[PDB]
């Protein structure tokens, strides 16, 4: 099964300040990764999708790159509603699998 | 030749916006892609995107914030880049270069150097350096002139309007008081000098500027 | 319309259920296969396109007993299907040149 | 000249733009996705050719939705181009076996 | 997004000695690697294509070797024009990707 590590597991960022997330997997999974973001007692939300796809109702604020095994979800500009839990989730191989999780932190 | 044509500068106050260009000449097929790659002083190379001209698709670089903007026209084989809202990380220099489709860039511009700043443009002040009337000569005379006080970079010295190329350096800038100061040297036979004359040319493409001055011995 | 015309077109229809349908079963197959890749709809379609044309570029391919069997689906539909268009296309050919003989 | 052999030259010319716009088109489909290799022109001319032929090595396949299509194009082309030739010969093989049973 | 390795950043040779660059690439490019020279204040320069092959121009002093991942541009018998740095950059993948260059210093 295809493992996602997010390293590190908390981002410390000043406000307005750029930040960028981490997702790397065991294998090569093209571009099939996905972004969720869950805040305190939420259910996670759709962020991107396929690496760098844009969700509608998500701020422009964030996008995603990467390819291949190395990935990342980026945020222009972090306030304080970003304050939350961000995880990957590959599609690429079954069964899905999910990151461990990063927490942001201003 | 020359492939890639680029103005040489451009001053951008901290939010505004400005539109590179790249004119192309030699020969222009279907197939062309045109990129453009940006380079921060001291910095290596990074890739913003590319645009195919004879469709007028782009693709860009993902992993930075898209601070670009890629059309071409057509009848003026000109692409252009539009970047939008800069601040003091989007100083740089950006090239653009030709593709052929097969990979590799077999031809680059010289670049235009972006300076994001508030300050004004101020065309620079030009200076001879003429040896002291006790120096004492060798079979080589050094002399320069001194570019001070310009904003923003860069200035562009020459030597006799390009002949003069072996015996010259010109130093890196200093900022001080949002103001630029450099210095160019040039070495030629002693007997050479003041028979054959020594002029120093030095345009400065932000202020649209290009002025000579001739190296005399002092009075 | 003349019947090698109208086998064709069926065998087009016809081909394209299977791709569909295939796309579908071929994922319903696979999924609690660990390490299979032949998972989503949309990659399905195309696997299943580049099956039934015998291309097979190893890209995409199933690993489940279930799913090769549908992939022998495919590629018998789609072998079958081209075939059937060439064997249109002769039965026009020689047509038309027992026309410009006369006969 | 007899309609199968000119079908067959027609499609021969036909089959060579496409294979020459397909190398085009690829190129223009799968350059702005991350990870594709289909994306300079000479290697995706062989691609095409790989692809129309349907052997399909998996050196070089496209990873995009259009360049998928673009693929398919390609691919069906091949078969029909190379299914044509086929069903050409066949008509001259049978001209050649009614002429020599003097029908 | 395929990662162009160039180590060391700085090479000190002595005049007329043989030098090489290394260009380490993340996973396999095949041969689709390209060198370019960048001397002070000056735009980059296509030295070789496809990791050997000659670019007209070039000095017959400059070659290329190299396959798959490891890849080197070397010079036979340096001298003082060539202190520069030097670039690679992959046509394998999209993107193209850079190297992070390598300073020769005499
Ligand atoms: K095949």
Request: neutral net charge; charged residues 15%; hydrophobic residues 35%.
């Amino acid at each position: 099964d295809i493992l996602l590590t997010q390293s590190p597991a908390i981002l410390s960022v000043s406000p307005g300040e750029r930040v960028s997330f981490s997702c790397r997997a065991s294998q090569s999974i093209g571009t099939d990764i996905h972004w969720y973001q869950q805040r305190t007692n939420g259910s996670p939300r759709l962020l991107i999708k396929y690496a760098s796809e844009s969700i509608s109702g998500i701020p422009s604020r964030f996008s995603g790159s990467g390819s291949g095994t190395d990935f990342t979800l980026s945020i222009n500009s972090v306030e304080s509603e970003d304050i939350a839990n961000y995880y990957c989730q590959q599609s690429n191989r079954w069964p899905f699998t999910f990151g461990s999780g990063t927490k942001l932190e201003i | 030749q020359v492939q890639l044509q680029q103005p040489g500068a451009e001053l951008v106050k901290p939010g505004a916006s400005v539109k590179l260009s790249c004119k192309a000449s030699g020969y222009t097929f279907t197939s062309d892609w045109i990129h453009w790659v940006k380079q921060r002083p001291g910095h290596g190379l990074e890739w913003i995107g590319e645009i195919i001209p004879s469709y007028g698709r782009a693709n860009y670089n993902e992993k930075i914030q898209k601070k670009a903007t890629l059309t071409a026209d057509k009848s003026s084989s000109t692409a252009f880049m539009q970047l939008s809202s800069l601040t003091s990380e989007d100083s740089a220099v950006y090239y653009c270069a030709r593709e052929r489709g097969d990979g590799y860039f077999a031809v680059w511009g010289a670049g235009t150097t972006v300076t994001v700043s508030s300050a004004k443009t101020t065309p620079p002040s030009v200076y001879p350096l003429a040896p002291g009337s006790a120096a004492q000569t060798n079979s080589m005379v050094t002399l320069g002139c001194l570019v001070k006080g310009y904003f923003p970079e860069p200035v562009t010295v020459t030597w006799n309007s390009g002949s003069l190329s072996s015996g010259v350096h010109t130093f890196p800038a200093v900022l001080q008081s949002d103001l630029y100061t450099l210095s160019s040297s040039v070495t030629v036979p002693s007997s050479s000098w003041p028979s054959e004359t020594v002029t120093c040319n030095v345009a400065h493409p932000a202020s649209s500027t290009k002025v000579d001055k001739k190296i005399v011995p002092r009075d | 319309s003349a019947l090698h015309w109208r086998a064709a077109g069926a065998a087009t229809v016809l081909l394209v259920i299977v791709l569909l349908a295939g796309s579908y079963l071929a994922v319903l197959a696979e999924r609690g296969a660990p390490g299979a890749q032949l998972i989503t709809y949309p990659r399905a379609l195309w696997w299943s396109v580049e099956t039934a044309t015998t291309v097979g570029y190893g890209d995409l391919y199933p690993v489940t007993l279930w799913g090769r069997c549908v992939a022998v689906v495919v590629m018998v539909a789609g072998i079958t299907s081209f075939g059937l268009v060439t064997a249109a296309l002769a039965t026009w050919f020689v047509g038309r040149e027992q026309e410009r003989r006369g006969h």
